[PDB]
Amino acid sequence: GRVRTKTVKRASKALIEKYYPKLTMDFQTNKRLCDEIATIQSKRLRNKIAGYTTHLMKRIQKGPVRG
Amino acid sequence: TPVTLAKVIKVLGRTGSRGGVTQVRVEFLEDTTRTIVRNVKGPVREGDILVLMESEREARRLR
Amino acid sequence: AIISKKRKLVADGVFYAELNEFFTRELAEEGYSGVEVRVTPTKTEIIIRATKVQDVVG
Amino acid sequence: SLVVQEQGSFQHILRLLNTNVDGNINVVYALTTIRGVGRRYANLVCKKADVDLHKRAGELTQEELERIVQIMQNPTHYKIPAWFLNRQKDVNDGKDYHSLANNLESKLRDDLERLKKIRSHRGIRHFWGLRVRGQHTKTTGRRRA
Amino acid sequence: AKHAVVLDQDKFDRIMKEAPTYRYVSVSVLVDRFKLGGSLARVALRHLENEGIIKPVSKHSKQAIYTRAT
Amino acid sequence: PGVSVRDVPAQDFINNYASFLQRQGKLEVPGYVDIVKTSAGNELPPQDSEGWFYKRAASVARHIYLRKQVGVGKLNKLYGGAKNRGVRPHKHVDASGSINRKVLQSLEKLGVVEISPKGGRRISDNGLRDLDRIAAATLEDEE
Amino acid sequence: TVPSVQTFGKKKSATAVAHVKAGKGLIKVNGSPITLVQPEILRFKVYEPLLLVGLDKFANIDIRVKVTGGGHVSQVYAIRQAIAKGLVAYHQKFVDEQSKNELKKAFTSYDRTLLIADSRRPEPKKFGGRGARSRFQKSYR
Amino acid sequence: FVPVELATTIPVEIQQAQQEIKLFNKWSFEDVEVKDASLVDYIQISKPIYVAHTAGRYANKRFRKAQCPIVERLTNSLMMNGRNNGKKLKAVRIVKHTLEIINVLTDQNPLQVVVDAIINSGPREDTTRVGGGGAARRQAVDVSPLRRVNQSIALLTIGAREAAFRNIKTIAETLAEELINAAKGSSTSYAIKKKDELERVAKSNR
Amino acid sequence: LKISTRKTPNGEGSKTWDTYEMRIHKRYIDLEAPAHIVKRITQITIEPGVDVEVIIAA
RNA sequence: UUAAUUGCGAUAACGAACGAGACCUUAACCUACUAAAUAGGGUUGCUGGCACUUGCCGGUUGACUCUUCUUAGAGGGACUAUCGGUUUCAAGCCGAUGGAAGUUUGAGGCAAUAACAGGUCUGUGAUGCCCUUAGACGUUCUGGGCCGCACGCGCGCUACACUGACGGAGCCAGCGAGUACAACCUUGGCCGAGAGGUCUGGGUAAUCUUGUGAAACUCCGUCGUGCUGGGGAUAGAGCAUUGUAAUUAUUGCUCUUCAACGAGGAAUUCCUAGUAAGCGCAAGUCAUCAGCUUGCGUUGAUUACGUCCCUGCCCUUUGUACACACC
Ligand SMILES: [Mg+2]
Ligand SMILES: [Mg+2]
Ligand SMILES: [Mg+2]
Ligand SMILES: [Mg+2]
Ligand SMILES: [Mg+2]
Ligand SMILES: [Mg+2]
Ligand SMILES: [Mg+2]
Ligand SMILES: [Mg+2]
Ligand SMILES: [Mg+2]
């Protein structure tokens, strides 16, 4: 059921591109960072974005990733 | 009549016409390293033991 | 005086609706857009927004 | 705690008021077989008599039966309030009446006849073979019985 | 009425000689071997239960199961 | 350590109370017994006949003890159930109010139940004592 | 001044508020002792917070439960939950942590509902049907 | 070992059944062996339950059904027919009665008997309606342990229900009888008969 | 405040319903003061849509 | 791959928009805030009953204080997190673990492009045109009819009992609704087997009805599988109630009557979790009438966690002499 949308994934990617230093690993910190930087309207959406970013970060620490 | 105890290794894709049968790879307990694949009714899983009636018989895709 | 609070609220809404309808009926040539109702102490305040203000004034 | 025995000293399989009032059935719930005596009424009658309700109708001493019978036909005599009867305030006389066994049916028939004679709607309905009590029959009851 | 559940004395006697060193002593059980039932079987059981012999294990409404004294 | 009604198996207590009442003879039976429905949505009068109005009274008393203030309508509501309305779904129907009223009156006469402020009925001190005694008796029996 | 805490138990709609106090060892539900409750077949559910961890913890803790809402079964469940909570809460507050942990372990091993309140709640009914999912009988003749 | 009372004094029986053994309705969940290779992990026992009524989240995932105490499952099964449907207390009561009956007759743990019944009423090979076009011809197929368990549970309950239809023999007694028949493979039981029939059918189709 | 209406005006169609709901917020504040002060407090701080109501005296 | 043109990808397309999603309402958690004699507690006054030691259950808006339950403001919280498998090591899916929550967290509200001769001119002082327009198709009274029955079908209710029936007794809900110009909801006291009267009240309402002590349920008893105490249709008579008016029983109650039906053929509907089903209650219409309806709780399963075999829909490739489109 749970597959992330354009508006999550793309945003997350953008965030990663901008802020790989200072957007690190664990969830809560990432969420906080998102809240600080991105102008996310909803809370839930923001949370989702943060989660995606965290996932991306996790993936990174095992090799490079496309896009 | 002989009865064998068959331990499931790999779930081998849900077959049948209505999807009421799960094809399964079973390697039986007291004769391990024998990979005879059979069709099973019900919710099956890896590591399950099956009580069957014919030890050496092949069950092919139910079309 | 002496009417249920929810009921009163409902009635208020109804009244507002009625007023709006009336304005739509009348001030069509003047180009009526919107009504505001303020039930303050002593006086009820009806604010009208229309395209022709002068006409409305008379 | 003790079972009340009796080998067969009190004779079973009885008849009261023409037809059959059989054994193994309770004192009250065998009086129901008699037309006109329903349940509550029967119970009341039993109470008036003073019979054990743990008793079969197959037993019973004759005196008790007689008393019950007496109670049955004339209840206004006894401590029965008499305002739960068939013909209370009555069709003709103006008395508390409760017909029983082979009589109630006859009375009903008579009433029906009277109605027919009068030429009221219910009578007409009865004559036809239809529903009196305004149960509108676009459907419902399609075997004539 | 298909009998089995009446009154009698022979039946009672039989019941009485059907209690020491016994497994099954219920209402249904009683009914089974052509004997009394309803709220008579229980009474019969009690008649033996009052003088030792049968012991109650379950006493629910319209369902009761009994076991002899060991 | 102390006994009260609140500490007793309820049915047993009720039974005990009924027995006590019977022993007394004192209550005032109005004489509706062996005629009446109890609940106006019933197929039958009581299956005990001789008594059980005592039982009802006892139950009422217990209820009163449990609560603060109890009335007639409330009692009816409590005691009524679901009337079989024929080929139609069941409905909650209140019990026979007159009977309840009579019971209350009897209780009052006895010195168990007392008319309260605001409205309805509460318990008398003597009544309370009696209840306590009954509870104690029940406990003893259990023991 | 007495060591006491206020823990609840919730199931479906039912709520049971248990006050756990220092003293002699009382377990009372709506004023009536634990020995009653009386759906009777579910009496052992209410006993499960007592006997799983033992009566040894109960020698100094007094439990007064007020139960409202729900049905009967639900109420019982709520009461049980409250009881489970209360001792643990007391331990956390006025005894020690290890003991509390042990208690939790004991509880957790046998049944989940004792500490974690049940997730499930009635789905709303919607139109074109008797219940939440079940529709009316559609007919094509 | 050691009875200690509190302020609100608890009955002795309850005290007795506490620390050493977590008894079921009023006897041990211990002993009671799953006497079959397979149907282990799919018949629960092991975890000692007090009542056959837990809250339970057993239809949530996939195999949450398998981690449910078998008694509870039986009760649930019993609960069927729409007039009876809901009313799990009644089912529990019935189960209790059955257990008592079992205890009374041939002794043992009634639980053990139940387990045996479950084992010996689950069909080993079933037939699915596979036509290869639309013809009513059937195909011989193996059975999952969970499925075997479930069907067994169903069958006994069904038999009990059938027995109960116009009888003095209160469902519980009937159920007990069925269990007895099953544990000591009889062919007088309904479930067992059904299983046998199924087996025969499978044999034919193969 | 709940209302249930068939979405249709005419009646034909799959029987679909509406749940038009209006939520009422009622809140009270208790003060011990002279009445004049209370009046002063309440004569200002009035926002359109909110109903300000005073019981006054014991 | 996904619930999804949801994504991962492959790539003469690249980057976008609407729809999906996001959203919003609601349902879940909050010993963290902010609060309360229109919520609930604690101690303590007085006070009732107990054992009688201090202790147990009570009644009182007598004090003082508290906010766990309560309500509802502001926040927080879950993002499939952590780990393990599996898969171009992708999107994702599966399994533990922690957690209030791990099926889009549960349920909805909204919902594109293009349409249909679908339904409404019996919702409209929305309405074209046509008819009609004073023996009016305007009206307004009066009675009747919409409800008639050889008969077809369509939702439903009641049931064919022993998992019951009937009697006691035990005894727990959540959504609601509720009058001053009327006659709303109506406790409590007396009268009545009921239905109902009556006097009095309390409430324009978290305050009173109302803890809606609702049913199903649980406890002990009577019948034990017989168209039987299963079941309740027709009936007959009375007593009530609403209304100006109850026959063509409005309805409520009382006694009596006891019909058809031992689980339903050809068929076929609905459904995957607090769901199915059981059971009431509730508002809607309402002067009066519930077998209907939107909600709501209460009790609570069985079985998949899949597949195109059927059915319908969608797409791709093909054929077409059809494009009012296979009627
Ligand atoms: Mg019924
Ligand atoms: Mg992983
Ligand atoms: Mg959604
Ligand atoms: Mg058309
Ligand atoms: Mg026109
Ligand atoms: Mg319909
Ligand atoms: Mg209320
Ligand atoms: Mg009859
Ligand atoms: Mg009408």
Side-chain angles (χ1 to χ4, degrees):
Chain A
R2 273 158 281 196
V3 181
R4 281 81 81 179
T5 329
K6 279 174 291 177
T7 50
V8 175
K9 288 200 180 169
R10 196 193 279 110
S12 171
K13 271 191 77 194
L15 255 310
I16 264 205
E17 159 264 310
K18 270 148 176 282
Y19 295 103
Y20 180 89
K22 155 215 162 186
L23 226 182
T24 48
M25 258 296 205
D26 94 81
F27 175 73
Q28 316 291 127
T29 50
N30 276 42
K31 181 225 274 90
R32 285 297 136 95
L33 286 153
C34 287
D35 168 59
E36 175 254 326
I37 46 204
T39 57
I40 350 87
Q41 286 291 282
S42 186
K43 180 209 276 176
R44 197 162 81 92
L45 216 200
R46 170 266 272 147
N47 217 107
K48 278 177 174 284
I49 285 162
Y52 203 61
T53 57
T54 61
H55 185 250
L56 289 186
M57 286 297 292
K58 283 268 285 292
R59 82 192 267 94
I60 263 116
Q61 290 158 64
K62 265 139 193 168
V65 278
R66 299 106 148 274
Chain B
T1 45
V3 157
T4 332
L5 308 157
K7 205 251 271 183
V8 181
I9 173 148
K10 172 139 267 179
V11 181
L12 224 284
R14 318 268 275 100
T15 53
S17 59
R18 298 138 191 269
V21 151
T22 313
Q23 200 157 105
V24 130
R25 195 194 276 111
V26 238
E27 293 186 60
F28 36 110
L29 282 163
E30 212 67 66
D31 188 34
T32 42
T33 69
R34 268 82 215 164
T35 61
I36 297 96
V37 184
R38 256 164 276 98
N39 285 309
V40 202
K41 194 176 192 168
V44 213
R45 168 204 258 161
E46 297 169 63
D48 296 9
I49 317 151
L50 305 166
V51 174
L52 71 157
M53 290 194 283
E54 313 302 313
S55 191
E56 257 71 37
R57 259 196 62 88
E58 199 84 298
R60 278 279 81 206
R61 284 158 190 172
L62 321 177
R63 284 146 73 186
Chain C
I2 334 106
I3 48 166
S4 186
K5 224 159 271 283
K6 44 159 94 176
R7 199 165 81 242
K8 189 256 179 74
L9 260 139
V10 164
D12 277 310
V14 167
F15 140 82
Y16 169 92
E18 216 295 269
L19 210 94
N20 218 76
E21 255 262 51
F22 177 53
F23 282 36
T24 316
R25 291 217 152 263
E26 268 273 329
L27 279 67
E29 307 85 15
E30 292 90 288
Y32 164 73
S33 77
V35 136
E36 202 208 316
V37 173
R38 297 180 172 200
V39 192
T40 48
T42 67
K43 294 168 187 178
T44 48
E45 298 281 292
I46 288 95
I47 294 99
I48 323 108
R49 272 89 65 177
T51 61
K52 262 93 173 185
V53 178
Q54 329 297 293
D55 275 72
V56 168
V57 169
Chain D
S1 58
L2 284 91
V3 185
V4 182
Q5 272 85 50
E6 279 90 68
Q7 303 176 354
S9 57
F10 297 95
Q11 258 60 48
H12 292 255
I13 322 147
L14 261 89
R15 260 89 266 180
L16 269 95
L17 230 169
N18 306 291
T19 342
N20 311 347
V21 179
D22 284 296
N24 283 129
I25 322 152
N26 214 292
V27 281
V28 177
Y29 284 100
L31 295 165
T32 69
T33 325
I34 312 152
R35 197 183 201 273
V37 212
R39 286 168 202 175
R40 190 177 164 189
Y41 188 75
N43 207 19
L44 271 137
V45 166
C46 214
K47 285 149 179 183
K48 222 91 268 174
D50 193 62
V51 198
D52 285 60
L53 306 176
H54 274 245
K55 259 190 159 188
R56 320 271 157 157
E59 283 170 60
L60 282 146
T61 51
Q62 267 92 315
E63 294 95 306
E64 202 73 51
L65 299 161
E66 275 137 52
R67 203 183 292 177
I68 289 154
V69 168
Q70 271 259 295
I71 292 155
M72 289 289 186
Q73 285 90 58
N74 296 311
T76 326
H77 285 236
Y78 291 87
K79 221 86 176 181
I80 290 154
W83 288 116
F84 40 80
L85 308 180
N86 280 312
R87 218 94 101 269
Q88 45 186 103
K89 220 162 270 82
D90 220 297
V91 63
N92 266 76
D93 38 293
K95 274 199 160 192
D96 302 298
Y97 261 77
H98 201 277
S99 48
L100 300 166
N102 309 69
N103 293 29
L104 321 92
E105 44 202 298
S106 77
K107 273 151 101 165
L108 254 137
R109 285 163 203 160
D110 230 53
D111 271 66
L112 289 154
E113 202 194 316
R114 288 157 184 163
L115 286 160
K116 283 183 180 181
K117 282 178 178 176
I118 74 160
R119 214 151 204 87
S120 56
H121 193 82
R122 42 177 57 88
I124 308 153
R125 231 103 186 82
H126 280 293
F127 203 103
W128 291 142
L130 296 170
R131 308 281 176 190
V132 167
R133 297 177 185 188
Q135 302 142 20
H136 53 246
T137 43
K138 202 162 187 167
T139 335
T140 59
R142 282 193 187 180
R143 274 142 61 185
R144 256 57 266 149
Chain E
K2 209 191 170 184
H3 288 282
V5 190
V6 194
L7 272 153
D8 268 297
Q9 205 151 301
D10 49 293
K11 219 139 276 183
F12 188 76
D13 283 25
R14 282 159 64 95
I15 294 158
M16 285 197 288
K17 289 195 89 178
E18 201 187 44
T21 55
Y22 251 83
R23 299 268 177 173
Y24 275 132
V25 265
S26 302
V27 178
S28 184
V29 168
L30 258 156
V31 176
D32 290 321
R33 276 180 281 186
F34 287 94
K35 296 150 197 281
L36 280 161
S39 59
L40 297 143
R42 221 177 232 89
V43 199
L45 290 162
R46 219 200 325 271
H47 229 288
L48 291 142
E49 183 184 334
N50 278 286
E51 312 300 311
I53 322 149
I54 294 160
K55 295 263 192 177
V57 191
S58 62
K59 272 190 171 181
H60 294 254
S61 190
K62 27 94 173 178
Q63 257 221 64
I65 317 141
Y66 294 89
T67 318
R68 64 96 184 185
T70 49
Chain F
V3 185
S4 62
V5 182
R6 190 65 66 36
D7 302 62
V8 195
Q11 193 200 11
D12 310 64
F13 164 85
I14 285 149
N15 294 7
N16 275 241
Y17 210 87
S19 78
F20 192 52
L21 267 158
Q22 251 156 34
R23 269 193 264 112
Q24 246 80 53
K26 285 179 179 178
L27 79 170
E28 272 105 320
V29 167
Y32 306 129
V33 181
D34 299 354
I35 318 153
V36 85
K37 291 256 93 166
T38 317
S39 289
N42 270 43
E43 277 178 282
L44 234 179
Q47 275 189 37
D48 182 77
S49 69
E50 267 288 297
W52 260 228
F53 292 80
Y54 288 77
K55 197 99 140 187
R56 223 282 176 83
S59 76
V60 167
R62 84 93 78 261
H63 213 257
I64 295 164
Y65 169 93
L66 295 177
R67 275 118 265 245
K68 302 164 178 180
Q69 302 170 32
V70 193
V72 176
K74 280 191 178 188
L75 274 174
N76 304 337
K77 190 170 188 181
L78 207 221
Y79 288 121
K83 155 86 152 284
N84 203 108
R85 283 151 81 258
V87 285
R88 288 147 76 201
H90 307 236
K91 285 195 87 183
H92 166 249
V93 184
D94 306 299
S96 67
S98 87
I99 272 75
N100 286 288
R101 208 201 312 102
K102 288 285 169 181
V103 160
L104 270 154
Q105 285 164 156
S106 21
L107 282 152
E108 294 263 318
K109 284 169 181 180
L110 215 297
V112 187
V113 172
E114 166 195 292
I115 350 98
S116 60
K118 293 100 160 192
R121 271 92 185 237
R122 61 185 169 194
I123 338 100
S124 298
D125 304 318
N126 283 314
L128 268 141
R129 285 183 143 89
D130 281 307
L131 293 159
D132 166 50
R133 282 151 194 163
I134 292 307
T138 318
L139 244 157
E140 292 298 310
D141 194 59
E142 282 171 57
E143 283 184 302
Chain G
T1 46
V2 279
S4 60
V5 263
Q6 309 173 298
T7 35
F8 67 94
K10 288 187 93 177
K11 158 70 92 169
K12 225 171 274 184
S13 183
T15 318
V17 274
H19 299 302
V20 280
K21 192 203 164 185
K24 288 177 180 181
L26 285 129
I27 331 103
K28 283 190 171 184
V29 182
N30 283 299
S32 62
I34 193 88
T35 61
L36 297 161
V37 291
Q38 285 184 249
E40 287 212 307
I41 205 84
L42 283 177
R43 218 197 216 107
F44 269 89
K45 289 265 103 177
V46 219
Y47 292 136
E48 276 164 31
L50 332 178
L51 37 72
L52 218 196
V53 83
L55 302 172
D56 62 305
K57 309 282 169 172
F58 283 83
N60 300 297
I61 302 160
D62 315 53
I63 316 98
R64 313 214 191 278
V65 201
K66 182 185 263 78
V67 201
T68 46
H72 297 284
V73 174
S74 61
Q75 272 201 330
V76 156
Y77 268 85
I79 309 159
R80 163 177 87 112
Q81 195 184 295
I83 303 157
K85 282 202 190 172
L87 309 160
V88 175
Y90 196 85
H91 276 272
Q92 199 250 248
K93 256 277 173 180
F94 301 112
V95 198
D96 204 277
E97 265 299 301
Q98 287 226 299
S99 56
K100 159 256 177 74
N101 280 307
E102 179 262 301
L103 255 78
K104 267 190 168 178
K105 204 87 185 178
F107 282 131
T108 44
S109 60
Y110 174 74
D111 259 296
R112 226 282 143 274
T113 40
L114 293 157
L115 283 310
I116 289 176
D118 210 351
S119 331
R120 314 137 98 183
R121 193 146 272 98
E123 276 190 45
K125 198 268 265 278
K126 53 223 69 138
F127 58 90
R130 319 284 292 174
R133 296 217 210 272
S134 62
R135 259 66 232 105
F136 301 141
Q137 270 196 234
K138 202 198 273 187
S139 59
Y140 6 74
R141 283 274 96 111
Chain H
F1 271 93
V2 191
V4 178
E5 280 86 66
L6 318 162
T8 39
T9 47
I10 325 100
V12 191
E13 315 258 52
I14 302 152
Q15 290 183 321
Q16 289 301 307
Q18 273 179 0
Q19 321 298 322
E20 299 96 301
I21 332 101
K22 285 98 169 183
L23 310 183
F24 183 44
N25 278 317
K26 221 60 260 139
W27 52 86
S28 66
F29 232 72
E30 286 198 65
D31 287 293
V32 190
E33 206 75 67
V34 181
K35 288 167 185 178
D36 201 277
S38 86
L39 316 173
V40 205
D41 311 294
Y42 291 90
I43 297 158
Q44 225 284 109
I45 43 104
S46 55
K47 331 291 162 191
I49 212 102
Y50 275 91
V51 210
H53 196 309
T54 54
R57 287 271 277 150
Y58 304 130
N60 196 61
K61 274 277 173 181
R62 207 200 196 276
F63 286 97
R64 287 274 171 271
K65 205 192 278 192
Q67 288 167 302
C68 175
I70 25 86
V71 277
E72 190 137 8
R73 266 207 273 184
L74 267 155
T75 61
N76 290 6
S77 283
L78 262 146
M79 259 207 293
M80 284 195 277
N81 264 250
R83 183 258 278 99
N84 180 230
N85 215 333
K87 313 167 197 187
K88 211 218 272 188
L89 299 181
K90 200 154 273 152
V92 175
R93 185 147 272 94
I94 297 153
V95 107
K96 252 255 207 175
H97 278 286
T98 75
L99 282 143
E100 215 69 68
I101 293 273
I102 307 152
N103 246 321
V104 162
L105 185 272
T106 53
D107 277 314
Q108 306 152 302
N109 272 291
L111 297 159
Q112 174 63 74
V113 177
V114 159
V115 164
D116 285 310
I118 288 161
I119 292 159
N120 295 301
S121 52
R124 298 154 197 88
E125 279 193 304
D126 278 326
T127 43
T128 44
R129 220 294 298 174
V130 182
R137 51 98 79 259
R138 307 188 74 85
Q139 198 79 46
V141 141
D142 309 61
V143 193
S144 182
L146 223 205
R147 185 163 215 268
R148 275 184 69 201
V149 166
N150 280 315
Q151 285 213 315
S152 81
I153 295 168
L155 287 158
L156 303 158
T157 35
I158 291 155
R161 198 133 54 245
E162 294 313 300
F165 234 115
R166 306 103 187 192
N167 229 123
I168 39 95
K169 214 151 214 175
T170 48
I171 358 77
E173 191 110 39
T174 81
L175 206 128
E177 284 183 308
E178 277 269 3
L179 290 155
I180 261 86
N181 287 17
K184 295 140 195 171
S186 77
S187 294
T188 52
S189 44
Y190 186 59
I192 273 199
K193 265 180 166 186
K194 284 157 102 188
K195 178 260 279 181
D196 292 328
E197 279 203 64
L198 288 170
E199 248 78 292
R200 100 193 152 86
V201 165
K203 204 70 72 189
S204 77
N205 279 304
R206 184 152 24 80
Chain I
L1 308 182
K2 217 98 80 195
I3 267 142
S4 302
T5 317
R6 289 271 278 101
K7 275 195 159 189
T8 64
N10 49 301
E12 193 270 352
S14 183
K15 300 159 196 177
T16 48
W17 286 79
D18 269 318
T19 322
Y20 283 99
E21 51 185 299
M22 188 207 283
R23 49 192 79 251
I24 268 82
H25 305 266
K26 185 178 176 175
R27 328 271 201 78
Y28 78 93
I29 194 147
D30 267 63
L31 287 159
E32 261 79 73
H36 215 288
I37 275 81
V38 165
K39 254 97 170 190
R40 287 158 97 266
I41 285 159
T42 45
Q43 274 166 65
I44 54 152
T45 73
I46 299 156
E47 275 77 73
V50 176
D51 194 286
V52 279
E53 204 273 313
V54 190
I55 274 90
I56 222 139

